[PDB]
Amino acid sequence: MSSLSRELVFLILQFLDEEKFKETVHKLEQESGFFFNMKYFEEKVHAGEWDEVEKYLSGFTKVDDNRYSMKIFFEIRKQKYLEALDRHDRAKAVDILVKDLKVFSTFNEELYKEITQLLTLENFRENEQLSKYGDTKSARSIMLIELKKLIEANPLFREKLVFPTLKASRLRTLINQSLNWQHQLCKNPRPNPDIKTLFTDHTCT
Protein backbone atom coordinates (compact mmCIF):
# COMPACT_ATOMS: atom_id res chain seq x y z
CA MET A 1 0.00 0.00 0.00
CA SER A 2 1.04 3.58 -0.83
CA SER A 3 0.74 6.15 1.95
CA LEU A 4 -1.84 7.77 -0.33
CA SER A 5 -3.98 4.67 -0.25
CA ARG A 6 -3.43 4.31 3.47
CA GLU A 7 -4.57 7.89 4.08
CA LEU A 8 -7.59 7.36 1.87
CA VAL A 9 -8.71 4.53 4.14
CA PHE A 10 -8.74 6.99 7.02
CA LEU A 11 -10.97 9.44 5.17
CA ILE A 12 -13.26 6.55 4.42
CA LEU A 13 -13.34 5.59 8.10
CA GLN A 14 -14.32 9.11 9.00
CA PHE A 15 -17.05 9.07 6.42
CA LEU A 16 -18.49 5.68 7.42
CA ASP A 17 -18.47 6.83 11.01
CA GLU A 18 -20.37 10.02 10.14
CA GLU A 19 -22.89 8.01 8.12
CA LYS A 20 -23.37 5.93 11.25
CA PHE A 21 -22.35 2.65 9.62
CA LYS A 22 -20.96 1.27 12.83
CA GLU A 23 -20.27 -2.35 11.86
CA THR A 24 -18.60 -1.33 8.60
CA VAL A 25 -16.23 1.03 10.37
CA HIS A 26 -14.88 -1.69 12.61
CA LYS A 27 -14.53 -4.31 9.87
CA LEU A 28 -12.40 -1.79 8.04
CA GLU A 29 -10.35 -0.95 11.11
CA GLN A 30 -9.74 -4.67 11.48
CA GLU A 31 -9.09 -5.57 7.85
CA SER A 32 -6.78 -2.59 7.26
CA GLY A 33 -5.22 -2.88 10.68
CA PHE A 34 -4.42 0.85 10.48
CA PHE A 35 -6.41 2.05 13.54
CA PHE A 36 -7.37 0.25 16.72
CA ASN A 37 -10.50 1.65 18.28
CA MET A 38 -10.11 1.51 22.06
CA LYS A 39 -13.59 2.74 22.80
CA TYR A 40 -15.01 0.00 20.62
CA PHE A 41 -12.73 -2.55 22.24
CA GLU A 42 -13.84 -1.64 25.76
CA GLU A 43 -17.48 -1.79 24.72
CA LYS A 44 -17.16 -5.27 23.27
CA VAL A 45 -15.17 -6.52 26.25
CA HIS A 46 -17.84 -5.30 28.66
CA ALA A 47 -20.49 -6.95 26.51
CA GLY A 48 -18.56 -10.21 26.73
CA GLU A 49 -18.57 -10.57 22.99
CA TRP A 50 -15.58 -12.82 22.89
CA ASP A 51 -15.83 -14.10 19.36
CA GLU A 52 -15.82 -10.57 17.99
CA VAL A 53 -13.16 -9.31 20.39
CA GLU A 54 -10.79 -12.03 19.19
CA LYS A 55 -11.79 -11.37 15.58
CA TYR A 56 -11.12 -7.63 15.85
CA LEU A 57 -7.77 -8.24 17.50
CA SER A 58 -6.80 -10.70 14.81
CA GLY A 59 -6.42 -7.84 12.36
CA PHE A 60 -3.70 -6.35 14.52
CA THR A 61 -1.85 -9.34 15.92
CA LYS A 62 -1.72 -13.13 16.11
CA VAL A 63 -1.59 -14.90 19.48
CA ASP A 64 2.17 -15.64 19.46
CA ASP A 65 3.43 -12.44 17.77
CA ASN A 66 4.92 -11.10 21.01
CA ARG A 67 4.59 -11.30 24.77
CA TYR A 68 2.01 -8.53 25.21
CA SER A 69 -0.28 -9.89 22.57
CA MET A 70 0.05 -13.36 24.09
CA LYS A 71 -0.98 -12.18 27.54
CA ILE A 72 -3.90 -10.24 26.00
CA PHE A 73 -5.36 -13.34 24.40
CA PHE A 74 -4.62 -15.44 27.46
CA GLU A 75 -6.46 -13.06 29.74
CA ILE A 76 -9.50 -12.93 27.46
CA ARG A 77 -9.77 -16.70 27.16
CA LYS A 78 -9.27 -17.21 30.89
CA GLN A 79 -12.31 -15.03 31.62
CA LYS A 80 -14.29 -16.93 28.98
CA TYR A 81 -13.43 -20.13 30.87
CA LEU A 82 -14.36 -18.75 34.28
CA GLU A 83 -17.74 -17.43 33.12
CA ALA A 84 -18.51 -20.94 31.84
CA LEU A 85 -17.63 -22.32 35.27
CA ASP A 86 -19.92 -19.83 36.97
CA ARG A 87 -22.98 -20.78 34.99
CA HIS A 88 -21.87 -24.29 35.98
CA ASP A 89 -21.54 -25.28 32.36
CA ARG A 90 -18.49 -27.45 32.79
CA ALA A 91 -18.99 -28.90 29.35
CA LYS A 92 -18.25 -25.53 27.81
CA ALA A 93 -15.44 -24.79 30.27
CA VAL A 94 -13.71 -27.97 29.12
CA ASP A 95 -14.23 -27.09 25.47
CA ILE A 96 -12.53 -23.74 26.03
CA LEU A 97 -9.75 -25.29 28.08
CA VAL A 98 -8.62 -27.70 25.34
CA LYS A 99 -9.39 -25.62 22.24
CA ASP A 100 -8.43 -22.09 23.29
CA LEU A 101 -6.15 -22.38 26.28
CA LYS A 102 -4.03 -25.41 25.43
CA VAL A 103 -1.86 -23.30 23.16
CA PHE A 104 -0.56 -21.54 26.28
CA SER A 105 0.65 -24.73 27.99
CA THR A 106 3.97 -24.84 26.10
CA PHE A 107 4.88 -21.52 27.59
CA ASN A 108 3.73 -22.42 31.10
CA GLU A 109 3.11 -26.08 31.88
CA GLU A 110 2.29 -25.75 35.53
CA LEU A 111 -0.14 -22.85 35.26
CA TYR A 112 -2.13 -24.79 32.68
CA LYS A 113 -2.40 -27.63 35.15
CA GLU A 114 -3.42 -25.24 37.93
CA ILE A 115 -6.16 -23.76 35.74
CA THR A 116 -7.33 -27.20 34.65
CA GLN A 117 -7.78 -28.14 38.31
CA LEU A 118 -10.39 -25.42 38.80
CA LEU A 119 -12.86 -27.73 37.09
CA THR A 120 -13.06 -29.96 40.16
CA LEU A 121 -13.94 -27.20 42.61
CA GLU A 122 -17.40 -26.49 43.96
CA ASN A 123 -16.57 -22.83 43.41
CA PHE A 124 -13.30 -21.61 41.86
CA ARG A 125 -13.23 -18.93 44.54
CA GLU A 126 -11.91 -21.78 46.65
CA ASN A 127 -8.60 -20.93 44.99
CA GLU A 128 -7.23 -17.92 46.90
CA GLN A 129 -5.70 -16.37 43.79
CA LEU A 130 -9.22 -16.35 42.27
CA SER A 131 -10.96 -15.59 45.59
CA LYS A 132 -11.34 -12.03 44.32
CA TYR A 133 -13.59 -12.71 41.34
CA GLY A 134 -16.80 -10.84 42.20
CA ASP A 135 -19.48 -10.81 39.51
CA THR A 136 -18.99 -10.92 35.78
CA LYS A 137 -19.49 -7.22 35.17
CA SER A 138 -16.77 -6.41 37.69
CA ALA A 139 -14.26 -8.99 36.55
CA ARG A 140 -14.63 -7.84 32.98
CA SER A 141 -14.07 -4.25 34.07
CA ILE A 142 -10.97 -5.00 36.10
CA MET A 143 -9.60 -7.12 33.28
CA LEU A 144 -10.24 -4.27 30.88
CA ILE A 145 -7.94 -2.01 32.85
CA GLU A 146 -5.27 -4.63 32.40
CA LEU A 147 -5.90 -5.10 28.67
CA LYS A 148 -5.72 -1.33 28.04
CA LYS A 149 -2.25 -1.28 29.59
CA LEU A 150 -1.13 -4.34 27.66
CA ILE A 151 -2.30 -2.83 24.41
CA GLU A 152 -0.81 0.60 24.97
CA ALA A 153 2.52 -1.12 25.74
CA ASN A 154 2.29 -3.49 22.79
CA PRO A 155 4.66 -2.29 20.05
CA LEU A 156 2.26 -3.62 17.36
CA PHE A 157 -0.36 -1.14 18.56
CA ARG A 158 1.55 1.77 20.00
CA GLU A 159 1.48 3.54 16.61
CA LYS A 160 -2.21 2.68 15.92
CA LEU A 161 -4.15 4.19 18.85
CA VAL A 162 -4.73 7.82 17.93
CA PHE A 163 -6.94 8.86 15.04
CA PRO A 164 -5.27 11.68 13.11
CA THR A 165 -7.39 14.73 13.77
CA LEU A 166 -8.95 16.31 10.65
CA LYS A 167 -11.81 18.55 9.52
CA ALA A 168 -15.22 16.85 9.41
CA SER A 169 -16.10 15.06 6.15
CA ARG A 170 -12.72 15.60 4.52
CA LEU A 171 -13.74 13.02 1.93
CA ARG A 172 -16.83 15.00 0.99
CA THR A 173 -14.70 18.11 0.66
CA LEU A 174 -12.26 16.36 -1.64
CA ILE A 175 -15.13 14.98 -3.73
CA ASN A 176 -16.36 18.51 -4.15
CA GLN A 177 -12.99 19.77 -5.37
CA SER A 178 -13.28 17.17 -8.14
CA LEU A 179 -16.78 18.37 -9.19
CA ASN A 180 -15.47 21.92 -9.18
CA TRP A 181 -12.51 20.73 -11.23
CA GLN A 182 -14.86 19.05 -13.71
CA HIS A 183 -17.02 22.13 -14.33
CA GLN A 184 -14.06 24.49 -14.56
CA LEU A 185 -13.16 22.56 -17.74
CA CYS A 186 -16.66 23.30 -19.18
CA LYS A 187 -16.81 25.83 -21.96
CA ASN A 188 -18.96 27.59 -22.59
CA PRO A 189 -19.79 26.89 -18.92
CA ARG A 190 -23.20 27.66 -17.50
CA PRO A 191 -22.71 29.39 -14.20
CA ASN A 192 -24.23 26.78 -11.83
CA PRO A 193 -24.94 23.36 -13.38
CA ASP A 194 -26.56 20.07 -12.34
CA ILE A 195 -24.46 17.01 -11.58
CA LYS A 196 -25.32 14.08 -13.78
CA THR A 197 -23.34 11.71 -11.54
CA LEU A 198 -20.14 11.01 -9.59
CA PHE A 199 -19.62 8.04 -11.83
CA THR A 200 -18.42 9.87 -14.93
CA ASP A 201 -17.06 13.37 -15.33
CA HIS A 202 -19.55 16.20 -15.45
CA THR A 203 -20.00 18.37 -18.51
CA CYS A 204 -22.03 21.40 -19.57
CA THR A 205 -24.09 21.68 -22.80
Contact residues for Zn ion (CB under 5 A)? 183, 186, 189, 193, 204
Quote the CA–CA distance of 38 and 148 in Å, as a whole number.
8
Contact of residue 191 among Zn ion, a copy of itself, none (CB under 5-8 Å per partner type): none
Are the CB atoms for 13 and 25 separated by under 8 Å?
A: yes
Closest separation in Å from C-beta 175 to Zn ion: 16
Closest separation in Å from C-beta 103 to a copy of itself: 11
Segment 4 to 43, residues that bind a copy of itself, using CB under 8 A: 4-5, 7-12, 15-16, 19, 21-24, 27-28, 30-32
Quote the CA–CA distance of 11 and 86 in Å, as a whole number.
44
Closest separation in Å from C-beta 104 to a copy of itself: 11
Are the CB atoms for 45 and 17 separated by under 8 Å?
A: no
Closest CA to 23 of 9, 40, 8: 40
- DSSP reduced 3-state for 35: coil
Nearer to a copy of itself, 135 or 192 (CB): 192
Segment 99 to 138, residues that bind a copy of itself, using CB under 8 A: 102, 105, 112-113, 116-117, 119-120
Contact of residue 136 among Zn ion, a copy of itself, none (CB under 5-8 Å per partner type): none
Contact of residue 186 among Zn ion, a copy of itself, none (CB under 5-8 Å per partner type): Zn ion
Closest CA to 11 of 197, 160, 182, 164: 164
Q: Which residues, in sequence order, are CB contacts of 48 under 8 Å at separation 6+?
A: 83, 136, 140
> 36-47 b/e with 16+ CB inside 10 Å = b?
bbbebbbebbee
**Site for a copy of itself (CB under 8 A): which residue of 90, 137, 149, 190?**
90
**Residues within the interface to a copy of itself (CB under 8 A):** 4-5, 7-12, 15-16, 19, 21-24, 27-28, 30-32, 90-91, 94-95, 97-98, 102, 105, 112-113, 116-117, 119-120, 164, 166-167, 170-172, 174-175, 177-178, 180-182, 195, 197-200
